[PDB]
Write a protein that binds this ligand. Structure first.
Ligand SMILES: CC(C(=O)SCCNC(=O)CCNC(=O)[C@H](O)C(C)(C)COP(=O)(O)OP(=O)(O)OC[C@H]1O[C@@H](n2cnc3c(N)ncnc32)[C@H](O)[C@@H]1OP(=O)(O)O)=[N+]([O-])[O-]
Ligand SMILES: CC(C(=O)SCCNC(=O)CCNC(=O)[C@H](O)C(C)(C)COP(=O)(O)OP(=O)(O)OC[C@H]1O[C@@H](n2cnc3c(N)ncnc32)[C@H](O)[C@@H]1OP(=O)(O)O)=[N+]([O-])[O-]
Ligand SMILES: [Cl-]
Ligand SMILES: [Cl-]
Ligand SMILES: [Co+2]
Ligand SMILES: [Co+2]
Lengths: 140, 140
């Protein structure tokens, strides 16, 4: 089952500048930073709250590491802003299979590594009324 | 203080069809529906989780009631997808004044009515790295 909003994926041109914006404006602090070279992003997670399923909700700020990447292509076309939304589940493999069986395109055969060792997959935005939708199971 | 992600505002052409998509695909159900004629939207709130500040996190699906509205203009330009993000606070007036004092444009002098009697205001996307950002205090 999808039991929380896990995060909002926000694309930006300069991760350090946009991190500073969220810290200065709202008092949000950095929970974690990492590079995902497969995905072609440098990311920062800002934790906003805990959630009733035992998880948490974050802002995931993403700067592309290369133009030839999902986020690099998207920023070039659209400018900075919301790139995707992510829902948390205790079983991404099972939930992804159930959604594949409804005819919504699941972009990975098998979940891939995401933030903080999580396992993630994506649903095609053109099957989700224009919203790139991620499914995530936390490593813990 | 901004203590939760309150909701994701998602624009759609057909509220009933997009509600059905979220119900069929993810098992989300409708928590509330209402029309906001000032804002020019028909909305449905889908509750995803409760949050550690005592509040909750929703998907807010929005269909325009008129072309000449924030969401009608935006859908015509961009197609369906994420329109805004909303953060919850126990004092929208105080937090909005603190953010106005940082030079981020606050679009209302005074918070206006939002979902379920909430009081809301917005920050200009061009001051927030491309993200239309709402601040909301729940009526309870
Ligand atoms: C590490 C991690 C992350 O979140 S990494 C996040 C970055 N990685 C990802 O996004 C991977 C998944 N995304 C993708 O594979 C691709 O970007 C998509 C789903 C396949 C689209 O790739 P395409 O190469 O087909 O892009 P393309 O520009 O060709 O566009 C294909 C269609 O999708 C639309 N589209 C593309 N990106 C979109 C987005 N982010 N949201 C909504 N619509 C989108 C686009 O406007 C076009 O619509 P249109 O036909 O109406 O004009 N984490 O830890 O949580
Ligand atoms: C009831 C409720 C709701 O949430 S009601 C939600 C619907 N209402 C609202 O959005 C009200 C707040 N929004 C607004 O007043 C306006 O839409 C904005 C902030 C002023 C923009 O209005 P404008 O008439 O200036 O729009 P305009 O198309 O002229 O565009 C002005 C600039 O803002 C950008 N922009 C417009 N809408 C945007 C959005 N949703 N996200 C990001 N960028 C946006 C746009 O791309 C352009 O950038 P560019 O210059 O780089 O091209 N609730 O209960 O929670
Ligand atoms: Cl890596
Ligand atoms: Cl009304
Ligand atoms: Co993500
Ligand atoms: Co809203």
């Amino acid at each position: 089952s999808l039991t929380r909003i896990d995060h909002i994926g926000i694309a930006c041109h300069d991760l350090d500048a946009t991190v500073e914006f969220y810290r200065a404006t709202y008092g949000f602090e950095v929970f974690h930073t990492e590079v995902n070279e497969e995905q072609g992003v440098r990311q920062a997670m800002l934790k906003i709250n805990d959630t009733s399923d035992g998880g948490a909700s974050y802002l995931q700020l993403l700067e592309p590491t290369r133009e030839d990447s999902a986020v690099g292509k998207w920023l070039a076309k659209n400018g900075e802003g919301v790139h995707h939304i992510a829902f948390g589940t205790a079983d991404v493999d099972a939930d992804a299979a159930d959604i594949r069986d409804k005819g919504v395109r699941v972009l990975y055969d098998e979940p891939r590594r995401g933030s903080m060792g999580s396992r993630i997959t994506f649903l095609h935005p053109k099957d989700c009324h224009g919203v790139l939708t991620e499914l995530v199971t936390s490593a813990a």
